[PDB]
Amino acid sequence: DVYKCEICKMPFSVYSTLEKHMKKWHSD
Amino acid sequence: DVYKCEICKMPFSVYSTLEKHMKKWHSDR
Amino acid sequence: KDVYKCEICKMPFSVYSTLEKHMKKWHSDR
Amino acid sequence: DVYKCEICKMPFSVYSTLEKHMKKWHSD
Amino acid sequence: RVQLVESGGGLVQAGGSLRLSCAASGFIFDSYAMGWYRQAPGKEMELVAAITSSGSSTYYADSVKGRFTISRDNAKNTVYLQMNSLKPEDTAVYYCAALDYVIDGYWGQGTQVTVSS
Amino acid sequence: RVQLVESGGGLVQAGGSLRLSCAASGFIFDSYAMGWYRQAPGKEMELVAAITSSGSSTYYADSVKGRFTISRDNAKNTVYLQMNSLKPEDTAVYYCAALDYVIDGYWGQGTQVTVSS
Amino acid sequence: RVQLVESGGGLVQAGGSLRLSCAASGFIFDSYAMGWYRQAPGKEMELVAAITSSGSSTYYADSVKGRFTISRDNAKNTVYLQMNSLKPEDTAVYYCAALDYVIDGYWGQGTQVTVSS
Amino acid sequence: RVQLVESGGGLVQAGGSLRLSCAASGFIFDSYAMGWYRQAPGKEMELVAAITSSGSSTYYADSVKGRFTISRDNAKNTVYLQMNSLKPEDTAVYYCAALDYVIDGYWGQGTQVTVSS
Ligand SMILES: [Mg+2]
Ligand SMILES: [Mg+2]
Ligand SMILES: [Mg+2]
Ligand SMILES: [Mg+2]
Ligand SMILES: [Zn+2]
Ligand SMILES: [Zn+2]
Ligand SMILES: [Zn+2]
Ligand SMILES: [Zn+2]
């Protein structure tokens, strides 16, 4: 029931940030 | 070149028997 | 840049580490 | 219930022989 | 441009294992993080596991941690999901995909997994 | 669902050692005797070593007796073949399979073992 | 001449594992087959496992084969007994000895193994 | 009453691989999380990797993530550390131990790892 990355659907927590997630799991 | 179990290719000797081989080594057969 | 570590097993502790969580996950007799 | 090597107590079967046992287990 | 061929699914009993494979082609495999997703009928799709382009980092849904292992072979363009200690809750069709393109909506056929109670 | 992933082969010097592993999934591993087989190119597939469902008995081909040791871990669904004092005659691809189904000829990828000199 | 020091025994639950070790000195270790024996009070001593001087071949009592594994380190003069899925019938004092001298009645102190059910 | 037999170290070139192993006895192995630590001359000890008793979670030092893999084999009372893409910064003596008792300061001999530039 949490928000998830709208590209890959990995769940986000309070510590997630768009920048960190994009850097780790997506290509610039 | 010896006779072997026709299922698993394990060689048989003068001491082998089908019953003993099947009981020890096979499950569904 | 040296950090505090669990004094039993020396695993590094961060700002979100807690004694209870760490004991629960990583220790058995303590 | 079965006979065993009198040195090391390994059980003998119908296929055991003293010579084979001695060479395998009591030799260098 | 992209092609993903999944296999290795089947029917097992509670406690069994399966190894899923995905053979990938039509893109530069080593450039992208890959994920295994599962889709059960009537339920939300779940990202089950993911692995960065190099393999250096992995993500797992909490419910599969310690049971599932994701890996990849960039020489063979393949992604694997080793599923041990399977449970009925794991029953679903499993699909593999490059993370960047999940939103594009193009998927392989997936591979069915059923875990009898 | 018989998925059999063999690993651990390689190039080794005569007299040396190697340990092969096979991870099994998709069937009730605990119920089946497993065998390690090998095929050199141009030669026949031959049974090298076998182990009962419980590990309560083993079998070794005459040419490897005293050099190879087969074992299994039913908790990991894994079969192992430790190979010591390797000889050039041991060069081949090695495969692992359930004895019951060897007749059906579905083999894994196998693992190459090459013993030089 | 012969000194053998066993250790590793203890209390363990049925199904559990224990690893026994023995340090050997006073003789040319790599010249002798070694074995693990067990003695429960009022019962017959039993040879549980043996390994030849070079380690190439083993013996296991029928009732422990597939659960126990004997090994040796000829560089470190040590013998090991890995015991898996222990049962109450395994409860005993365990001893390690060179096979040649078992009849001569010198024994190390042994190590106690107790398997609760 | 605790014994830790570590091996697998050696001299290797940067980019190479090693596999360390530690066989443990004198405690109930599967009850305890295990850690690989490294100690380099004149530096602070570093917990390199750790694995929970159930094998379900692992920890890695930031500098070895994606390069080292810790695992355990409870059927062999053994912990393994697979080290790929070794760097000169990985040079040190490696020691394995139960997390619960590291503070008591009883260590095995460890196994030496040297990575050449
Ligand atoms: Mg990470
Ligand atoms: Mg089947
Ligand atoms: Mg080992
Ligand atoms: Mg975790
Ligand atoms: Zn994403
Ligand atoms: Zn057969
Ligand atoms: Zn700790
Ligand atoms: Zn004897």
Side-chain angles (χ1 to χ4, degrees), chain A, chain B, chain C residues 2-30, chain D, chain E, chain F, chain G, chain H:
Chain A
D1 35 352
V2 292
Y3 175 76
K4 306 175 240 299
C5 169
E6 291 170 52
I7 312 176
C8 75
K9 300 162 176 280
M10 182 179 295
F12 276 18
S13 67
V14 67
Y15 311 115
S16 309
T17 69
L18 295 167
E19 197 175 295
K20 296 206 281 94
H21 173 78
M22 294 303 292
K23 226 281 203 80
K24 186 168 192 177
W25 296 105
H26 300 284
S27 330
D28 17 32
Chain B
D1 257 357
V2 290
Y3 179 74
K4 312 164 230 133
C5 176
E6 290 167 44
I7 303 153
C8 68
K9 312 178 194 307
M10 177 177 302
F12 276 25
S13 77
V14 59
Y15 303 113
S16 313
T17 70
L18 263 5
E19 195 171 316
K20 275 154 88 148
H21 179 78
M22 299 303 304
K23 179 82 172 298
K24 179 172 283 181
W25 294 108
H26 290 288
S27 305
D28 291 349
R29 315 197 98 110
Chain C
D2 293 337
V3 289
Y4 178 76
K5 311 169 182 69
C6 168
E7 300 168 40
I8 302 144
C9 72
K10 308 216 140 145
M11 192 186 181
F13 266 22
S14 80
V15 66
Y16 329 103
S17 314
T18 81
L19 290 182
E20 206 169 303
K21 271 153 87 101
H22 177 73
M23 305 320 287
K24 173 99 182 315
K25 184 172 176 160
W26 288 110
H27 290 283
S28 304
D29 290 348
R30 334 185 85 115
Chain D
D1 44 306
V2 297
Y3 176 76
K4 299 170 269 127
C5 173
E6 292 173 52
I7 302 158
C8 73
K9 307 184 184 281
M10 183 174 302
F12 277 21
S13 69
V14 65
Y15 312 109
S16 299
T17 73
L18 293 167
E19 178 170 16
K20 291 206 265 226
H21 178 77
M22 293 305 293
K23 177 202 183 205
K24 182 169 187 171
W25 289 109
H26 297 288
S27 169
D28 332 89
Chain E
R1 176 194 99 161
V2 181
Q3 221 203 82
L4 271 350
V5 188
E6 300 111 328
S7 58
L11 167 69
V12 297
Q13 327 184 172
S17 37
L18 280 165
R19 190 211 205 197
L20 306 186
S21 294
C22 177
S25 57
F27 62 102
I28 306 166
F29 182 77
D30 64 70
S31 296
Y32 299 88
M34 303 288 144
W36 280 98
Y37 298 76
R38 62 188 177 192
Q39 177 71 75
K43 307 203 320 216
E44 221 168 273
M45 174 174 265
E46 188 179 19
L47 168 62
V48 173
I51 182 157
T52 62
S53 24
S54 67
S56 58
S57 185
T58 49
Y59 161 87
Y60 295 99
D62 296 331
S63 75
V64 307
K65 280 177 177 172
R67 309 189 291 117
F68 291 9
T69 301
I70 185 173
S71 52
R72 62 190 298 156
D73 192 320
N74 293 342
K76 316 181 305 201
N77 277 28
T78 307
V79 201
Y80 304 103
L81 192 64
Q82 183 63 44
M83 302 180 295
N84 303 331
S85 314
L86 283 155
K87 302 167 175 198
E89 70 196 67
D90 299 318
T91 290
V93 186
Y94 285 66
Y95 304 84
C96 189
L99 262 42
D100 287 350
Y101 299 119
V102 166
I103 184 169
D104 288 2
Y106 160 81
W107 300 86
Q109 301 191 30
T111 188
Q112 291 160 110
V113 172
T114 305
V115 182
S116 81
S117 258
Chain F
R1 300 289 355 123
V2 286
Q3 201 60 52
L4 293 171
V5 185
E6 303 107 336
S7 63
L11 175 56
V12 80
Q13 207 59 69
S17 286
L18 257 196
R19 189 183 305 157
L20 310 185
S21 310
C22 176
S25 36
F27 66 99
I28 302 169
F29 183 73
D30 302 1
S31 296
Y32 295 97
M34 308 287 299
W36 279 99
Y37 295 76
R38 69 187 173 190
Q39 186 167 32
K43 303 303 184 37
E44 193 203 321
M45 182 80 68
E46 68 177 359
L47 168 71
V48 170
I51 184 160
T52 57
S53 322
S54 55
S56 65
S57 300
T58 55
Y59 164 85
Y60 298 100
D62 275 354
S63 66
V64 313
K65 248 182 237 196
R67 304 190 295 114
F68 294 12
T69 306
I70 185 173
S71 64
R72 74 193 283 156
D73 183 342
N74 283 349
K76 301 174 161 307
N77 295 162
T78 296
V79 200
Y80 308 100
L81 192 67
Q82 179 68 40
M83 297 179 298
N84 298 329
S85 307
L86 282 157
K87 303 173 176 177
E89 71 190 66
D90 298 316
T91 297
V93 181
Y94 284 70
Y95 306 84
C96 195
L99 265 39
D100 273 2
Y101 293 100
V102 156
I103 184 167
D104 290 337
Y106 312 141
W107 298 99
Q109 298 176 327
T111 325
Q112 178 72 40
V113 169
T114 307
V115 189
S116 41
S117 309
Chain G
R1 200 188 84 161
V2 170
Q3 296 286 284
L4 312 155
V5 180
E6 298 97 345
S7 67
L11 228 186
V12 62
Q13 283 185 11
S17 296
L18 275 184
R19 172 176 234 252
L20 269 36
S21 72
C22 174
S25 65
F27 62 107
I28 309 297
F29 180 77
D30 68 359
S31 175
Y32 293 91
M34 305 292 300
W36 282 98
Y37 296 80
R38 69 188 171 183
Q39 177 73 80
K43 309 293 200 204
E44 286 294 325
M45 176 177 263
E46 181 178 26
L47 168 72
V48 166
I51 186 171
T52 63
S53 54
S54 71
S56 63
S57 296
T58 58
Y59 162 87
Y60 296 96
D62 291 342
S63 70
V64 311
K65 194 159 170 66
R67 315 189 287 117
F68 293 11
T69 301
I70 188 183
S71 55
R72 69 189 287 158
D73 192 335
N74 283 350
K76 310 247 163 181
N77 280 24
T78 55
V79 195
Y80 303 101
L81 193 64
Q82 178 73 26
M83 296 177 305
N84 296 324
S85 28
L86 287 157
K87 311 173 191 164
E89 73 192 54
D90 296 319
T91 295
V93 180
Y94 283 67
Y95 299 91
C96 191
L99 266 41
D100 273 13
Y101 303 114
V102 161
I103 189 192
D104 294 333
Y106 158 80
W107 296 90
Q109 294 307 300
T111 182
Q112 172 74 51
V113 175
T114 308
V115 185
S116 56
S117 51
Chain H
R1 214 282 185 297
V2 172
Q3 297 187 236
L4 302 156
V5 184
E6 295 128 319
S7 61
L11 168 65
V12 72
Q13 293 252 63
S17 312
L18 281 173
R19 185 173 175 89
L20 314 181
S21 69
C22 177
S25 61
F27 58 101
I28 307 303
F29 181 75
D30 69 11
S31 288
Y32 296 96
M34 305 290 301
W36 280 98
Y37 299 75
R38 66 184 161 198
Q39 180 71 66
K43 325 252 82 161
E44 176 167 72
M45 178 168 62
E46 173 175 35
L47 172 63
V48 157
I51 184 163
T52 64
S53 33
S54 44
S56 62
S57 305
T58 59
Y59 163 82
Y60 299 94
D62 283 359
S63 62
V64 305
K65 286 180 170 178
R67 296 192 302 119
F68 294 5
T69 307
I70 185 167
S71 51
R72 68 188 305 144
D73 190 343
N74 292 354
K76 298 182 74 172
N77 268 44
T78 296
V79 187
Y80 303 102
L81 187 67
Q82 184 62 50
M83 318 186 286
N84 301 336
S85 321
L86 282 156
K87 311 192 224 203
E89 83 195 50
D90 295 321
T91 287
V93 196
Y94 282 71
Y95 301 83
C96 195
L99 265 42
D100 276 1
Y101 293 106
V102 159
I103 180 164
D104 291 356
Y106 290 111
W107 295 96
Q109 303 189 6
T111 181
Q112 290 168 108
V113 167
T114 301
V115 180
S116 281
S117 314

